[PDB]
Amino acid sequence: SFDGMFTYGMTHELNEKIMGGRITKIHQPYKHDVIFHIRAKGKNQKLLLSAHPSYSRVHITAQAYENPSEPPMFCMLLRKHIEGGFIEKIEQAGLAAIMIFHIKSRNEIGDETVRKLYVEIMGRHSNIILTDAAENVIIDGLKHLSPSMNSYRTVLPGQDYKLPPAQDKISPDDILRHLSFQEGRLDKQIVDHFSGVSPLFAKEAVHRATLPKALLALFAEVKEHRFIPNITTVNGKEYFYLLELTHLKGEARRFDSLSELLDRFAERDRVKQQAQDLERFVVNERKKNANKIKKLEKTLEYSENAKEFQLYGELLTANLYMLKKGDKQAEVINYESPTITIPLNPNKTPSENAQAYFTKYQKAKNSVAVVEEQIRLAQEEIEYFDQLIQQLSSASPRDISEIREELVEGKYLRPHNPVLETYESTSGLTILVGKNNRQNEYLTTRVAARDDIWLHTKDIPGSHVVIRSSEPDEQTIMEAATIAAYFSKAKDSSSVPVDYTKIRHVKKPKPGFVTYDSQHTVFVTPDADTVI
């Protein structure tokens, strides 16, 4: 996505705002991410830079995410030599995925000085560098890179800055001249002729079918800033670029600002890794418990001779006067008047024999009670983990952090008021929820009354959510159903019924084994982020 074209567009379209922008504040929220709160054009604005390899970019965000509590070394070095700066000029580095800020600032003696901040966004080996104007000497560097990689250039401070080897590509018919169109798969080798290229862009342009026209038209489009910043979604795999989608089936959502496009599109992936690593373990336990009860059930089918012995003891105590001590059998009638032949021990008395039948009934009864208790335990656990996986599917990190501690408390694992999360709702209302079982319970109990309404699934497993004293209109009643169906055992399931019931009948009986009464149910379906 982040081609030299997108780059060059940004270069002009941010100089539109930040001619001589006064750098009011500097922060480094994450590792490979840096924020400047700059004052330009009589206004304060945010400026995010990222050398985060897959997410390396530049951006201006309404979401000033979080300035850190720790000022890191790189941040403080920027504060040393750029703070209170002045953004004289921006430059595109000749359309490569690289940018330059020509900046001015007074030194520690009030004498004006300048510098060249360079932002190379190459992909896996992007970087951010600061350099002197005249000397071209590097002063700071985010990813120091020693010449052990035997590379052309080097990062380290003090050294004369150098740029990468610019490839032998005509950065802007010439392809029909140079390249033999017989080659095929030319979406590959447009990269071999042009500077700012994505295989996405190359493919979408090659699919326009000899097509120099497409290239020239799109280059004129970009040069004229004629693009349309949208995000494309080809069955997921959400992509975005200056140009719209050209051919594929994917959905498209357009924007007014490339910056807002970047916004709505370093640590998220880490949290995802943690979440998946935990989800694996949870599924292992739930699957294990399910197979455990399968073992117990198929074992149970082989010791079930209780009632026979019960009935035999009954009959023998009823017929304890016709019976010799030494006999093998007993033709006996049931109290439907069948005639049963019960075996005996020819050594024992009928009293002894009947008592033995009662004993065996007692024993089988006991063992079955044991197995049924183990069944109850395992099924409770399985339902607990199933709700847990529902929550983890419909989770946020803020509740995942609580779920981890919940499980460490359950001792499946090993190693304070923020509870709920909400968004917009119908009737201009606010509907709060929690993907964590514990936070959901905290909200259901401590954050609402009894006469309020709880809305959850009318089905096996889903989250729990409600508005503060949820008594709004049917608009909000149906809007809560969308939030319920979104975070459920089957997201995007277009037949999910939601149950709405007074909180006064919310059963606070493992954890999150909450039954419900005073309930109604409405068939509904999942929805989009408009549910927010």
Binding site: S146, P147, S148, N150
Partner: protein
């Protein structure tokens, strides 16, 4: 110390197994002499190396075992590359 150990601690080669393998192939040399994984090394040593055709010449400054990642490259200096 040994060449294979040195290469690993300096992170020139990522596995001692590979260092042994390439030294047994004899793709490398020291002070213009062919060498082996058990070959001794010290500060001031001049090392010649190959990665297919990529020929490399480097200089030894230090040696140690604990070798944290960034400190590994202080152990030596690149001099030159050829092919």
């Amino acid at each position: 110390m040994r060449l294979d150990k040195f290469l690993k601690v300096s992170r020139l080669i990522k596995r001692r197994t590979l260092a042994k393998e390439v030294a047994d192939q004899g793709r490398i040399s020291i002070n213009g002499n062919q060498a082996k994984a058990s070959s001794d090394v010290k500060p001031g040593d001049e090392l010649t190396v190959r990665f297919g055709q990529k020929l490399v010449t480097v200089q030894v400054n230090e040696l140690k075992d604990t070798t944290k990642k960034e400190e590994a490259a202080n152990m030596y200096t690149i001099l030159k590359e050829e092919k």
